[PDB]
Write an enzyme that holds these catalytic residues in place. Sequence first.
Site, mmCIF file in Angstrom:
data_model
loop_
_atom_site.group_PDB
_atom_site.id
_atom_site.type_symbol
_atom_site.label_atom_id
_atom_site.label_comp_id
_atom_site.label_asym_id
_atom_site.label_seq_id
_atom_site.Cartn_x
_atom_site.Cartn_y
_atom_site.Cartn_z
ATOM 1 N N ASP A 221 0.238 -8.012 1.849
ATOM 2 C CA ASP A 221 0.481 -6.577 1.757
ATOM 3 C C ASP A 221 1.974 -6.273 1.853
ATOM 4 O O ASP A 221 2.382 -5.325 2.523
ATOM 5 C CB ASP A 221 -0.274 -5.846 2.867
ATOM 6 C CG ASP A 221 -0.090 -4.341 2.808
ATOM 7 O OD1 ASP A 221 0.195 -3.814 1.712
ATOM 8 O OD2 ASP A 221 -0.231 -3.687 3.864
ATOM 9 N N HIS B 287 0.823 -1.206 0.000
ATOM 10 C CA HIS B 287 0.000 0.000 0.000
ATOM 11 C C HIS B 287 0.859 1.259 0.000
ATOM 12 O O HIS B 287 0.425 2.315 -0.456
ATOM 13 C CB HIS B 287 -0.961 0.016 1.196
ATOM 14 C CG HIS B 287 -0.286 0.182 2.522
ATOM 15 N ND1 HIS B 287 -0.007 -0.878 3.357
ATOM 16 C CD2 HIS B 287 0.151 1.293 3.170
ATOM 17 C CE1 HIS B 287 0.578 -0.433 4.455
ATOM 18 N NE2 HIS B 287 0.685 0.880 4.365
ATOM 19 N N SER C 70 4.532 1.801 9.588
ATOM 20 C CA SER C 70 4.011 0.768 8.711
ATOM 21 C C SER C 70 5.041 0.474 7.624
ATOM 22 O O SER C 70 5.490 1.379 6.923
ATOM 23 C CB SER C 70 2.691 1.222 8.090
ATOM 24 O OG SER C 70 1.956 0.123 7.584
#
Lengths: 191, 191, 191
Positions: free
Chosen positions: A81, A51, A146
């Site tokens: 992801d 992402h 992240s």
Amino acid sequence: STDETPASYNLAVRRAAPAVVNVYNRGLLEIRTLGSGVIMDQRGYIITNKHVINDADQIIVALQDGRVFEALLVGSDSLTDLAVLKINATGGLPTIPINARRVPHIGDVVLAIGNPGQTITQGIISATGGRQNFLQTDASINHGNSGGALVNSLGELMGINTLSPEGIGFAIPFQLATKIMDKLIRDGRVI
Amino acid sequence: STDETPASYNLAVRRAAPAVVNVYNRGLLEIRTLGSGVIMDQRGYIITNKHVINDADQIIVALQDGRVFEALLVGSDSLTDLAVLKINATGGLPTIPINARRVPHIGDVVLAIGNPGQTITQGIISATGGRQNFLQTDASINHGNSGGALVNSLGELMGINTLSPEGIGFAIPFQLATKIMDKLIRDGRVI
Amino acid sequence: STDETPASYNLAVRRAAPAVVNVYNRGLLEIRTLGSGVIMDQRGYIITNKHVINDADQIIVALQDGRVFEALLVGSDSLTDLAVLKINATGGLPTIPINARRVPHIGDVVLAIGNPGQTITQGIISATGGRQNFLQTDASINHGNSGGALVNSLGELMGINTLSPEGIGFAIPFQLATKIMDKLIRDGRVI
């Protein structure tokens, strides 16, 4: 007090933090901060979140020591992801410590390292981790970290911080992340 | 790194976690997850939250080792939001370690153990605890661990996780929880 | 278990907590809780947040040991949101341990101490700190501890808890806080 030493996990920060990097996009002039990443080996491969790099015109990576490379997308994996990037490795790249023999246990102290300066948070492994469920921790996992690394008190990689049942964060176990990386390096996007 | 051992509270998890259980309701077929609980002794008594079992048609309890019993409600206590359940004890029930001589101190490391797999979080005792005010901790206390146990680095019970001034969680001190349990075992609901 | 000692930071609480105080306002009869504060030296000077004392008709300070003084505002500093108060020092004031030689490192364990009984939370230094950027920590920093002290495992002051990018709290490094205090003691409000 003056004599004694404060309790600290700075040892693990010194060993691991150099390998965690900032990932950027360079749209055309605009520069945006995408997230964090982790340098895995000397070949110059880097793991981040799918992402983070999903809509990147040009991908830039910036180390803590001041160096700035452009990265190319090796491939990604939607289920976990994850995403693997590649950069040219000037002699001497800092790499994330990895111990394939190390077995993560519930209760293990972990630090989440991410580069939004660098930001580090502390927790434990709440729960050990598509193919398999992920690792849980109460160390704060946010956008600023992240894609970064989760490490134990020794600096050894336990997983890759990921986003998306409250108060708990998620990382992809380093064993699974290694295998996904390899398969992405060989084939490309893999299913 | 390969040689050394990671900082960990897994010792306390191994000693205490087997005793923390999942509590369910079995309405008529529907099965719902009510919350967590703690096995106190070999007689088969279990503490949980009054709110977890408040509207239970049939109460089921599930250990980490795979065993599944039905529990009957011994009685409850609204002020402390506690409830005592009872199950038949096959030879060998795992019980929560208790040290009546242990005095909890502010700053003590604690793990909140609850079974929504099992989920564990780490904090300290922020503040030592109707009859008396409760124990405070910055370990995450949520529905997934409400009714479960709070334990120190040794695995000794410090309190019962409870829900309901931000960022702080609450547990009922193990000394008070023991006394409430006893009084509920003898009389029933007690006032 | 009965033999061994629980992992704890109570040593740092005993050394530092006596110096952290409650700050009140006494408008005319109404009494309101403004926040927390820290006693710095035997002269009777106390640091808190400018926002805590911004609209105070009469300022009262209350120690953990039971003593209650009135404080006068020495001066403040808007950029760092600090404020220095003054009280008469009966022989024996508890003061916050300070080590000017101690260098704070990323990963250092820290406790945030504030008096809303007293409330203590644990984290680490995520990032080392107008003149300079502030210290970051994942120890909960809220109104109940805003203006209080952040200390390491030894009890040594690392900074002053302040309020106002999620999951991270801020403290003003103790080196900068010392200098601001001094300059406020000499001149008044300083620019």
